A and B are shown apart, each in its own frame.
With several copies, the nearest count.
Chain A
């Protein structure tokens, strides 16, 4: 605020209050495997090379 000279209206106090909010934006990516991959990952048939 700035003090006023003669003849000019003096300025009053003010209090200004504002609010802000967040936002959301999820992301997704898939990956897929074949049943043969899942079989051969666990199972070792007869152990050959």
Chain B
């Protein structure tokens, strides 16, 4: 697998540009209306049950 450390995800000719896939139950959004640019975070939260 070739993986991207810093950049966009695209073909050899940038003829197509790939998206990042998030499984639905893992997706979070916290504002009613989003601003133009939004940053993506990965959160791991521990429950002490």
Contacts and interface: CB of A to CB of B under 8 A. Distances in A.
- Chain A contact-residue range equals under 10
A36 interface: yes
Nearest to B16: A36
Q: Is the interface of A mostly helix, strand, loop or mixed?
A: helix
Dominant secondary structure of chain B at its interface with chain A: loop
Interface of A: 34-36, 39
Q: How big is chain B's contact interface, by range?
A: under 10
Interface of B: 10, 13-15
Nearest to A39: B13
A46 to B, nearest CB: 14
Contacts of B10: 35
